[PDB]
Design a binder for this molecule. Sequence first.
Ligand SMILES: Cc1cc([C@H](C(=O)N2C[C@H](O)C[C@H]2C(=O)NOc2ccc(-c3scnc3C)cc2)C(C)C)on1
Lengths: 103, 143, 87
Amino acid sequence: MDVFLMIRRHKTTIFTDAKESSTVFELKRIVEGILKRPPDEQRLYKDDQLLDDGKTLGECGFTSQTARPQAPATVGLAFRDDTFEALCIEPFSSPPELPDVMK
Amino acid sequence: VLRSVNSREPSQVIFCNRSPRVVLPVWLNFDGEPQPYPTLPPGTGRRIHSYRGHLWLFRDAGTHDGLLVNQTELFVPSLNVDGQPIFANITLPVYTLKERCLQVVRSLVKPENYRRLDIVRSLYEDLEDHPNVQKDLERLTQE
Amino acid sequence: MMYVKLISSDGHEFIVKREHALTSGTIKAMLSNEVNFREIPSHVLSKVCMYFTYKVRYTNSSTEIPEFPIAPEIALELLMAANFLDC
Ligand SMILES: Cc1cc([C@H](C(=O)N2C[C@H](O)C[C@H]2C(=O)NOc2ccc(-c3scnc3C)cc2)C(C)C)on1
């Protein structure tokens, strides 16, 4: 099955796809080509829980029925150059209040 | 152009709602008039008695939002070969973002209040242009 | 895989495949590999990039096609984006 993802560090958001049975390490290779930091300098979170490289994305609960093109699953990114940074994913904007006539 | 041949040869057809929408299946009668039929609840399928060369289109039962049937806009029951009923697979189309946005705003805003939003008068018109089967049948007659 | 950067009104850098962003003509136009959007906020431009994926995946698909979800609170500004972007 295919899975669709937002890999997010601070302001930077990255839309990408993969297969359920592809690994978290292949997802760190993707970020390497794009942001030019090797996989050993990255740390991938699902909701602030650190993910083991060796684990498949279906094992980590990124399925076709959660990681959908229209609703891709978030993946948190932390970079290293002595120790790893605190996961800081800057939130998206706030939708304004609904006009009276949509309530 | 668009009306059912009265072939008088029957065809066992499965309307398969493979969409989240409540579906309104619409037979084009012998005068080319769109005649509605009982609505399918979402993800349900019914085996119906129709006739070869008859013409069918499907719409959202609540908003006449246009759906597809086996990838295309119109369905024509063919001959049942090996007693195996023909499948009418009714899916959502890949609406444009603009059309999907319109559907959603229409679904929330009472038609009166369309004028009472803060958007260009270009878009009020796009809002008021509710999907119409008749206007679409008219549109599709031309080359 | 050639990617492109879609900066929003609040500085959010959205990175999407090139062949997913030529879904929008308006973008197709600007390119024919960063693109700023002084008027489009990120809670919108997030959702646009999801459509791009949604359209490339399900256009010409024999598979059941699922709804594109739009939350009431974004609907009015996402429509105004949709229209500006020719998609
Ligand atoms: C001879 C001859 C007969 C006809 C028409 C006719 O019987 N038709 C027109 C279509 O082929 C379907 C079929 C129908 O109406 N069959 O009965 C149905 C009743 C309900 C359904 C449906 S659609 C969704 N829910 C149900 C149960 C489908 C067919 C008459 C209306 C004139 O045209 N030539």
